[PDB]
Amino acid sequence: RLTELREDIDAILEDPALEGAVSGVVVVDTATGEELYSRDGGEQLLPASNMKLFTAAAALEVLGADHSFGTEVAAESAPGRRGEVQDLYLVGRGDPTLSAEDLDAMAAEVAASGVRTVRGDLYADDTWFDSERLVDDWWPEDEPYAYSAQISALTVAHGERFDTGVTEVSVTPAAEGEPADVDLGAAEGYAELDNRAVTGAAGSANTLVIDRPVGTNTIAVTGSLPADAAPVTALRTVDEPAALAGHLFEEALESNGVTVKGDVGLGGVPADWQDAEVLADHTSAELSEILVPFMKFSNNGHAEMLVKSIGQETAGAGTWDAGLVGVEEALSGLGVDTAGLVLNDGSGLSRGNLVTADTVVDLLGQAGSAPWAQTWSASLPVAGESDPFVGGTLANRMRGTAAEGVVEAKTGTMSGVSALSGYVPGPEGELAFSIVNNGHSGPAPLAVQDAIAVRLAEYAGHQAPE
Ligand SMILES: *[C@](O)([C@@H](C)NC(=O)CCCC[C@@H](N)C(=O)O)C(F)(F)F
Numbered sequence: 001r002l003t004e005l006r007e008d009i010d011a012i013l014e015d016p017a018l019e020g021a022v023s024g025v026v027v028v029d030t031a032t033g034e035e036l037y038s039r040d041g042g043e044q045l046l047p048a049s050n051m052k053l054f055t056a057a058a059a060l061e062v063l064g065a066d067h068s069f070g071t072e073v074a075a076e077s078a079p080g081r082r083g084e085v086q087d088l089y090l091v092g093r094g095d096p097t098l099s100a101e102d103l104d105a106m107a108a109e110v111a112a113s114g115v116r117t118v119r120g121d122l123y124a125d126d127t128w129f130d131s132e133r134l135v136d137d138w139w140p141e142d143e144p145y146a147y148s149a150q151i152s153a154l155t156v157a158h159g160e161r162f163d164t165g166v167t168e169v170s171v172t173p174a175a176e177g178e179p180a181d182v183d184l185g186a187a188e189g190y191a192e193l194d195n196r197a198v199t200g201a202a203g204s205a206n207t208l209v210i211d212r213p214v215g216t217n218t219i220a221v222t223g224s225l226p227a228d229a230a231p232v233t234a235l236r237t238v239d240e241p242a243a244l245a246g247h248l249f250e251e252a253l254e255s256n257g258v259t260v261k262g263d264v265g266l267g268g269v270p271a272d273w274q275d276a277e278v279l280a281d282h283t284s285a286e287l288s289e290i291l292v293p294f295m296k297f298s299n300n301g302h303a304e305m306l307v308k309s310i311g312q313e314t315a316g317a318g319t320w321d322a323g324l325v326g327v328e329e330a331l332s333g334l335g336v337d338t339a340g341l342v343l344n345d346g347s348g349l350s351r352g353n354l355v356t357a358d359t360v361v362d363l364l365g366q367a368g369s370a371p372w373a374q375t376w377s378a379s380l381p382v383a384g385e386s387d388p389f390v391g392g393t394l395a396n397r398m399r400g401t402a403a404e405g406v407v408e409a410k411t412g413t414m415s416g417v418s419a420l421s422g423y424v425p426g427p428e429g430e431l432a433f434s435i436v437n438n439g440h441s442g443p444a445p446l447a448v449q450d451a452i453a454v455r456l457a458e459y460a461g462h463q464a465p466e
């Protein structure tokens with residue numbers, strides 16, 4: 001039955017959608033170590049978001065499953081009878097899940113501690129990581145979009161998915177001829193607005209564009225929204241995520257009865273502060289719980305923050321240079337051969353990343369027999385699962401196939417780069433696989449990837465749910 005499988009994958013790989021593409025495909029039985037299929041497995045390819053597999057495993061080795069993240073509010077000394085402080089500091093230490101609600105709860109704690117007036121300025125301290133916001137080879141044209149958000153120690157995460165360093169723009173039509181209404185979300189009064197957008201006639205064509213022009217903190221809205229059209233919402237990144245957090249914190253303080261008399265800006269807690277008074281703190285959920293929104297939806301910002309958190313633990317440097325070496329060592333310490341790996345970031349957004357399909361499968365084996373294996377696999381998207389927090393990037397794929405509910409795999413997609421890697425659990429044995437496509441021209445060869453993943457589920461002894 002093993003020859004039948006080899007013939008089937010050979011035929012799937014001759015799909016015309018893979019014209020001019022190099023594709024690494026490796027399948028291994030983890031119970032035996034048997035190499036069921038291998039094609040260009042040593043070839044170096046861009047992984048896209050399959051890079052997160054390496055990042056996640058390294059984070060669980062370096063930081064541990066029980067690891068959580070802190071944010072604190074600091075003043076030089078406690079407030080007195082008059083309840084006055086001078087300068088106040090919001091200090092972030094790499095929480096990727098810090099919501100506006102959490103800023104509110106910290107504002108309430110600052111009020112309940114006796115502070116009524118912040119007489120000086122309020123500062124956002126994100127010096128726990130460096131101020132290098134973006135990886136060198138990331139494309140400037142990508143910068144307005146959530147997956148390309150700037151990386152900071154102090155950032156506000158949006159929604160239940162915890163998209164960091166962004167704001168929600170909402171555009172609403174008005175009457176035909178009148179300007180569209182633009183709602184900047186959290187970045188209201190932080191980011192500049194350039195609204196050139198108009199409301200078009202009922203039934204006219206939607207031509208609405210929402211942009212942040214490179215190197216500015218301005219949201220430029222252009223084009224035309226039809227009068228009868230549904231409101232358009234989009235996540236856009238801001239410049240200096242910590243400063244936005246600072247902005248949102250002032251609003252939180254002012255709403256909890258604390259007057260801020262000064263300005264909002266960046267600044268680290270001064271060195272000459274003898275014994276800083278912690279007026280409020282927040283602790284995140286543990287890394288095992290954080291891994292879910294991170295891996296399920298493939299959060300880029302989370303990955304880069306984790307890398308720099310690795311840099312802090314291994315070296316006390318919230319730095320790409322440190323964290324990426326930290327990732328490499330952690331993988332080596334796990335039993336993974338890192339020869340074919342080139343690490344340029346944690347998210348896989350960098351086109352300077354390189355993996356081989358063998359290395360991915362190697363990692364999947366070593367991860368499978370690790371103490372944190374269950375929190376590891378619980379994070380991976382599950383083929384065909386309706387629940388977005390279970391299905392993830394695989395939620396609307398492989399439904400009604402042998403793979404549905406069974407295959408746990410990480411996706412990866414950019415221009416000319418597509419990947420699918422994970423496990424096929426079968427009664428006799430757990431299968432591990434990697435599929436990495438580079439150079440194809442159409443859209444991601446998802447049909448090809450799904451066909452292989454389904455055939456392997458069938459091989460492992462599964463049938464399609466009906
Ligand atoms: C993952 O594959 C990540 C790395 N990909 C993206 O976030 C999309 C990046 C777009 C880059 C753009 N310049 C291009 O199309 O090449 C995953 F799963 F998150 F998508």
Ligand SMILES: [Mg+2]
Nearest residue numbers: 158159168233
């Ligand atoms: Mg939303």
Ligand SMILES: [Mg+2]
Nearest residue numbers: 187188189190
């Ligand atoms: Mg505001």
